[PDB]
Amino acid sequence: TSRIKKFSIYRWDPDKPGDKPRMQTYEVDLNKCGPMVLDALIKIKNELDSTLTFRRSCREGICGSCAMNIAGGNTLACTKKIDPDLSKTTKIYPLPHMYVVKDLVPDLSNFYAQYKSIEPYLKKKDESKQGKEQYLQSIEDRQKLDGLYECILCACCSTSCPSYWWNGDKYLGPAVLMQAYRWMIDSRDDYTEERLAQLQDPFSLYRCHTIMNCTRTCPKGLNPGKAIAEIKKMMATYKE
Amino acid sequence: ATTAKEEMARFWEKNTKSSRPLSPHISIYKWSLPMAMSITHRGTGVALSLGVSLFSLAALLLPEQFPHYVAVVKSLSLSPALIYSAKFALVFPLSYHTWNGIRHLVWDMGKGFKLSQVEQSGVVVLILTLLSSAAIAAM
Amino acid sequence: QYPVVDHEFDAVVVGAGGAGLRAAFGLSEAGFNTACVTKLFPTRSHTVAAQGGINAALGNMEDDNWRWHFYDTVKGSDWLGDQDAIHYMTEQAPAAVIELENYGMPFSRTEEGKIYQRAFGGQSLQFGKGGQAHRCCCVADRTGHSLLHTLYGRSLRYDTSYFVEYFALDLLMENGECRGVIALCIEDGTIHRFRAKNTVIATGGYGRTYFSCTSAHTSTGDGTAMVTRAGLPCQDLEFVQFHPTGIYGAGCLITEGCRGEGGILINSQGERFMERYAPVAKDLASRDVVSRSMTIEIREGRGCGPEKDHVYLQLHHLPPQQLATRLPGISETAMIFAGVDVTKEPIPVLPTVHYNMGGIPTNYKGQVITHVNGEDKVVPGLYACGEAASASVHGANRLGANSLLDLVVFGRACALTIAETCKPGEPVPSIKPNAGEESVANLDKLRFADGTIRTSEARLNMQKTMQSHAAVFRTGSILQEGCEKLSQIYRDLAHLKTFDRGIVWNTDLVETLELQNLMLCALQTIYGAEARKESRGAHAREDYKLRIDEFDYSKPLQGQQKRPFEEHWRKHTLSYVDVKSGKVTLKYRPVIDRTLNEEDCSSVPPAIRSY
Amino acid sequence: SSKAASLHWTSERAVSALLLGLLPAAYLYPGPAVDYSLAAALTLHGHWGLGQVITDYVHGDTPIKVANTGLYVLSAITFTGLCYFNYYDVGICKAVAMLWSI
Ligand SMILES: *Cc1cc2c(cc1C)nc1c(=O)[nH]c(=O)nc-1n2C[C@H](O)[C@H](O)[C@H](O)COP(=O)(O)OP(=O)(O)OC[C@H]1O[C@@H](n2cnc3c(N)ncnc32)[C@H](O)[C@@H]1O
Ligand SMILES: CCCCCCCCCCCO[C@@H]1O[C@H](CO)[C@@H](O[C@H]2O[C@H](CO)[C@@H](O)[C@H](O)[C@H]2O)[C@H](O)[C@H]1O
Ligand SMILES: COc1[nH]c(=O)c(C(=O)[C@@H](C)C[C@H](C)[C@@H](Cl)CCl)c(O)c1OC
Ligand SMILES: O=C([O-])CC(=O)C(=O)O
Numbered sequence A: 001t002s003r004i005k006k007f008s009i010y011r012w013d014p015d016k017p018g019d020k021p022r023m024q025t026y027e028v029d030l031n032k033c034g035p036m037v038l039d040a041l042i043k044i045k046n047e048l049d050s051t052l053t054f055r056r057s058c059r060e061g062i063c064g065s066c067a068m069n070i071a072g073g074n075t076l077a078c079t080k081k082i083d084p085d086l087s088k089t090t091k092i093y094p095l096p097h098m099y100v101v102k103d104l105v106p107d108l109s110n111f112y113a114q115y116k117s118i119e120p121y122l123k124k125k126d127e128s129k130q131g132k133e134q135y136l137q138s139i140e141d142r143q144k145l146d147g148l149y150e151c152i153l154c155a156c157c158s159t160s161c162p163s164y165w166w167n168g169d170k171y172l173g174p175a176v177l178m179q180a181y182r183w184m185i186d187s188r189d190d191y192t193e194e195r196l197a198q199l200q201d202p203f204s205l206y207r208c209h210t211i212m213n214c215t216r217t218c219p220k221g222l223n224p225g226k227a228i229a230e231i232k233k234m235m236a237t238y239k240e
Numbered sequence B: 001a002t003t004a005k006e007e008m009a010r011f012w013e014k015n016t017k018s019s020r021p022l023s024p025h026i027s028i029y030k031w032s033l034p035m036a037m038s039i040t041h042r043g044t045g046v047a048l049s050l051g052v053s054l055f056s057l058a059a060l061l062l063p064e065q066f067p068h069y070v071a072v073v074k075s076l077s078l079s080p081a082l083i084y085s086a087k088f089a090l091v092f093p094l095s096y097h098t099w100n101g102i103r104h105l106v107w108d109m110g111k112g113f114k115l116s117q118v119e120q121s122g123v124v125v126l127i128l129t130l131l132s133s134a135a136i137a138a139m
Numbered sequence C: 001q002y003p004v005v006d007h008e009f010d011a012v013v014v015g016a017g018g019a020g021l022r023a024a025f026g027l028s029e030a031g032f033n034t035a036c037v038t039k040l041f042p043t044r045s046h047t048v049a050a051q052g053g054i055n056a057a058l059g060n061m062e063d064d065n066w067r068w069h070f071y072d073t074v075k076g077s078d079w080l081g082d083q084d085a086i087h088y089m090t091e092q093a094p095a096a097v098i099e100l101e102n103y104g105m106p107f108s109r110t111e112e113g114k115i116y117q118r119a120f121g122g123q124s125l126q127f128g129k130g131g132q133a134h135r136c137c138c139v140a141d142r143t144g145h146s147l148l149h150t151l152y153g154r155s156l157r158y159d160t161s162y163f164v165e166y167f168a169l170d171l172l173m174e175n176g177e178c179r180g181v182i183a184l185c186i187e188d189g190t191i192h193r194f195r196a197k198n199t200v201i202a203t204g205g206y207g208r209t210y211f212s213c214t215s216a217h218t219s220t221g222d223g224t225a226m227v228t229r230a231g232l233p234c235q236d237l238e239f240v241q242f243h244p245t246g247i248y249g250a251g252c253l254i255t256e257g258c259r260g261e262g263g264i265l266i267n268s269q270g271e272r273f274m275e276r277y278a279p280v281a282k283d284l285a286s287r288d289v290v291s292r293s294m295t296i297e298i299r300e301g302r303g304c305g306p307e308k309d310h311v312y313l314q315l316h317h318l319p320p321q322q323l324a325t326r327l328p329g330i331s332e333t334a335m336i337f338a339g340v341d342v343t344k345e346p347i348p349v350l351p352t353v354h355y356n357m358g359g360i361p362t363n364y365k366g367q368v369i370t371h372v373n374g375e376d377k378v379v380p381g382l383y384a385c386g387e388a389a390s391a392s393v394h395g396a397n398r399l400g401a402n403s404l405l406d407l408v409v410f411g412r413a414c415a416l417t418i419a420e421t422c423k424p425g426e427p428v429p430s431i432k433p434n435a436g437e438e439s440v441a442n443l444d445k446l447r448f449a450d451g452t453i454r455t456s457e458a459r460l461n462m463q464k465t466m467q468s469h470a471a472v473f474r475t476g477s478i479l480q481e482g483c484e485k486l487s488q489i490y491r492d493l494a495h496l497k498t499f500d501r502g503i504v505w506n507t508d509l510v511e512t513l514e515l516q517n518l519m520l521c522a523l524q525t526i527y528g529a530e531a532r533k534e535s536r537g538a539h540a541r542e543d544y545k546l547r548i549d550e551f552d553y554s555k556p557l558q559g560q561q562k563r564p565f566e567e568h569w570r571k572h573t574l575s576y577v578d579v580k581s582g583k584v585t586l587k588y589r590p591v592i593d594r595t596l597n598e599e600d601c602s603s604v605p606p607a608i609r610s611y
Numbered sequence D: 001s002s003k004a005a006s007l008h009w010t011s012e013r014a015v016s017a018l019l020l021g022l023l024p025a026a027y028l029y030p031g032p033a034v035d036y037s038l039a040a041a042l043t044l045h046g047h048w049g050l051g052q053v054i055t056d057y058v059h060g061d062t063p064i065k066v067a068n069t070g071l072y073v074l075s076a077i078t079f080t081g082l083c084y085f086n087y088y089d090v091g092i093c094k095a096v097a098m099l100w101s102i
């Protein structure tokens, strides 16, 4: 009358002086649990171990709070189905190569700061008309944003890039870079050339070697790898 | 009211002096075929580059010229199975890096970025690597 | 025992959703040194999950008039909405949506290059006599996602000092004036006092008071509880909106835009039953009518699925190109959470808690008000906007795509009212050195709680009590049982048991502090429901099935004796709680029926409400 | 020039294409024309390739310059030895033919 599924979860407590990172095993009856991994994490926190800490909010894959490494791959716990194979133990880690605040909560301050550094907002050279009439944009030029604006900033793609592991301090990563591309090709933006000159350095953009782990792990089905390649094509063709 | 440069400096200054651990990555992340093929392209590149430089150093430091060492190997009368092993082992990294290099040049044109195409192009590179390494090593 | 860090700004905003962000950089846009306190990263707020769109009479799809949107919202509110605030919201709607598009919001486009607008529930032309309206501006079906990320990116251009992962505990009150907020830094476990001349509350709703809700786990009504603990009243908390199409199981939202593009509701026999409940509007009636209609179809024996506890939302009759262009988000959600291909099979849906009409009572300027001796008096230094506030532009039933409008319209209104009332850099009010120590004492008590009822168990019994005692259809006997059980749960909060003795990212303690907030909101919601003996909007009483106004507006007003104020119910409920005992005290204030200009926008008298 | 990063990326793809085009040229037209072009293309392509590995993996202002300086010396000797082999010995194309005749 049960189905015991095993979860091995990374644990670390900054409040314990001397606590070393450890894996803890929890047993969950899948008959009394939802289909997604976040449902198991919430069930464990509610009933088994209320000290288990993790980010969550929307539980529907739109906010991007519950990004973590489930079974070797970065994904959203709220949309990652539980492996019903009771023989295998699902291993849950934080996002890879990230400073751990506590348990499964990484520090995304640098990730957020890199997104601010590319100035992700509409910039027109004549902003004396802002708040008057809606800017015109054709359906075809609006279609160019499909696949780019749905990014939820979960950092599943950036934390899966090996170049981001070795050079996360100066390489922006696939998440920020795709958003930089989202504003380069926005037909309403007038700072397209300025946004490319910012990437004229060996690290911000050109640390991408087309490894393509970013696209494989994106829970939104987006392709930050292809957007980076479109940036590289723009960098080599634009004039000043 | 801090800018992104200050937030990045605050991030590193805070975390590098803290007691927070770095979450695992190498020992825990799941591998895939494109991931293994990307590093192999780097490995064969480093191997070919250092094999060219070793050959270049031998030209400046060995007391005999190339036709002499070719005659020395022939006199040893090595078996065909041993000759085929060295030919295949030497042409395999060059064959792989060449096919996967064209695949990288295709990527740089913005073509073949659908994830199902990345798996296709990788498998095509592998069979062309084996085909061109078996034909050349037979000559 | 806790290190205290004192901050001083010209204004402090508690919240980073649509309303919180728009007010945050709107104050910095006015030269105010402003802080923005939020327990989540701004793009994680519940606004990101909004799908349908935002209303505005842009006139992109047909000849429109903002006064028609005004009439729809007033009729939608069932005449519990303050018409001066509805006037302000609907007239500013074209300017607010244009401002968002100028910020870079990637709205869906028409063949003319303008913003695309879809139909939505309860929207009409020619003051309710001209046919179905199309004024819901949308980014496909990811409107709130694109609205929140555009506002967050816009806020990065101003000197707004952000405080992310800070949990606001209580307000710093002195002599009836708000001096700021006290908060807990989740990252490093320190207590922070933010002193400011003005404080804005935009903390969202409290949909998590029930067992099944479309809300996020973080929508716990923390700003509603800070007001209640401060001794100030909350307004109309018993009016809870049940969205018609919440997906079966996880309770995730399936947007009303599905019905706006052509989607219909069918029962177990494939009947479009909304043709029978509302022959004119059909599936595009008001949400309170559609939610009650779906409930009756299930309760009478025409439910769908195996357990007959839901109905079907049919979209497969629509072309697949339109589904992929207009409704891509729900197409993927219906597959992940229901295994449904919207091009072949319908979606299982049922009414689900979605939005809180009630909240912190404000005026049309965003200023929080208290009511003493029949006179609305402004609380000096306190503002509110968004779902946490009760303007009340929504009254007893909010129209779809009006909350996102409320967010940006009244979020900016708080910044505008401060910019005209106060100057930047004025002397910050001095708080006494021990201000907020009762919030720290409550935090430390819960941090070492060691009773018999853990936080997850007390939160569950509350959610199940609200779910079965203050649902769609309500009765007096069932509401009283819920009140007696909710007061017992509140008294059993002294038996709380927590396990995490830490202070850095102690989500066990934070979810317990949210439980204290949820209980205060849940008490006033069900106690305000037990007292309100009428049927208005989403508050439907099966023992008092009539709407009771000061006049019988279904008959000629000539020769009618006006009912006294204490003998009708067209009035707001004002709720108070003594947080020690859990006692709920109820008062009432009149509904503002006047507008901002009678010549420009005529006041709509109460009438019989039909769709 | 402020477009140095994008021009280096473009120059790399240009050499990779040229180096790819010399492999059929070496099989069809072996001789001193292809020998020195191979010596040039192999050195430049390998110098930039090893420079990306250093950029990705070597951190620290001193270790970065130590690795990059030793790479310039490696490439300079590599190009000088290949050009020595093409002028004083049989050449690159002839050597591979003699090697494969074994
Ligand atoms: C749930 C929902 C609502 C919704 C919708 C779809 C869903 C799934 N679609 C809508 C639509 O298409 N059109 C529309 O007009 N409305 C729609 N809604 C309703 C609407 O989105 C919400 O009412 C609105 O988004 C609420 O916005 P608001 O800015 O008022 O609040 P929020 O976005 O929920 O964010 C609240 C912020 O407050 C901070 N917070 C909360 N508590 C604290 C404490 N204690 N300390 C500090 N900060 C706090 C949070 O961080 C959050 O940022
Ligand atoms: C000489 C040079 C040789 C280079 C290659 C060496 C061999 C590498 C072997 C590594 C294969 O590692 C394996 O790759 C396959 C295909 O990418 C992965 O499979 C993946 O794709 C398949 C097919 O869509 C799906 O099942 C799912 O997405 C995922 O499992 C698998 O998870 C991984 O475990
Ligand atoms: C082509 O560039 C590259 N390609 C790679 O596959 C690559 C790698 O993926 C490995 C070498 C890195 C290491 C084995 C970890 Cl990430 C596996 Cl769990 C890597 O680090 C790299 O350089 C940045
Ligand atoms: O609540 C609203 O305003 C509209 C909404 O969630 C929907 O799209 O169904």
Ligand code: SF4
Pocket: A150, A151, A152, A153, A154, A155, A156, A157, A158, A174, A175, A178, A217, A218, A219, A220, A221, A222, A224
């Ligand atoms: S690109 Fe995908 S994985 Fe990366 S942040 Fe955006 S949604 Fe997340």
Ligand code: F3S
Pocket: A160, A161, A162, A163, A164, A173, A174, A207, A208, A209, A210, A211, A212, A213, A214, A215, A224, A225, A228
């Ligand atoms: S995985 Fe990394 S190397 Fe480039 S293609 Fe994606 S950002």
Ligand code: FES
Pocket: A038, A055, A056, A057, A058, A059, A060, A061, A062, A063, A064, A065, A066, A067, A076, A077, A078, A079
């Ligand atoms: S919790 Fe919002 S994405 Fe998983």
Ligand SMILES: [K+]
Pocket: C356, C357, C358, C359, C386, C387, C388, C389, C390
């Ligand atoms: K409200």
